[PDB]
Amino acid sequence: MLIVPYNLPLPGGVVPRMLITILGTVKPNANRIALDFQRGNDVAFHFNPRFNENNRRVIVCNTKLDNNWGREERQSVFPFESGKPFKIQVLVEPDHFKVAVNDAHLLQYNHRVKKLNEISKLGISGDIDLTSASYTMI
Ligand SMILES: CO[C@@H]1O[C@H](CO)[C@H](O)[C@H](OC(=O)c2ccc(C)cc2)[C@@H]1OC(=O)c1cccc([N+](=O)[O-])c1
Ligand SMILES: [Cl-]
Ligand SMILES: [Cl-]
Secondary structure, eight states, X not given: OBOSSEEEEOTTOOOTTEEEEEEEEEOTTOOBEEEEEEETTEEEEEEEEEEEETTEEEEEEEEEETTEEOXXXXXXXXXXXXXXXXXXXXXXXXXXXXXXXXXXXEEEEEOSSOOGGGOOEEEEEESEEEEEEEEEEO
């Protein structure tokens, strides 16, 4: 595998046309996954599948500025399953991050942090076996 939590440096930050691909398998009895796109201590984009929030499955997205979480954005479409292999693709577009799972569009998240070239690391964490994490310019 890779060791989770896993840091993927994003050299010179993110830019439109940058595609991040994450391959892994969800652990049995998973509780959470998190992708954290970081600008130093700030989290520009937190993508957080929650397998059992009051017996519901929900993806929580948010931004952390100066250690404070903002307004959450919630999605009820939940393509992940305990025990099963997934592919997450995060495409940086001008106005938003665009997320697909298993080749199907899931959600978009408007840029709240504006200094895209300072979003210099991706943290991958949670209840997964992480196979690979990479980027390409499309
Ligand atoms: C108000 O709740 C917070 O919401 C944030 C997003 O708006 C983050 O998701 C926080 O979590 C972390 O930053 C965080 C969590 C764990 C670690 C190890 C590191 C960082 C925290 O999550 C929970 O409260 C929460 C409540 C119930 C369930 C879950 N979950 O992820 O399943 C999260
Ligand atoms: Cl590793
Ligand atoms: Cl900013």
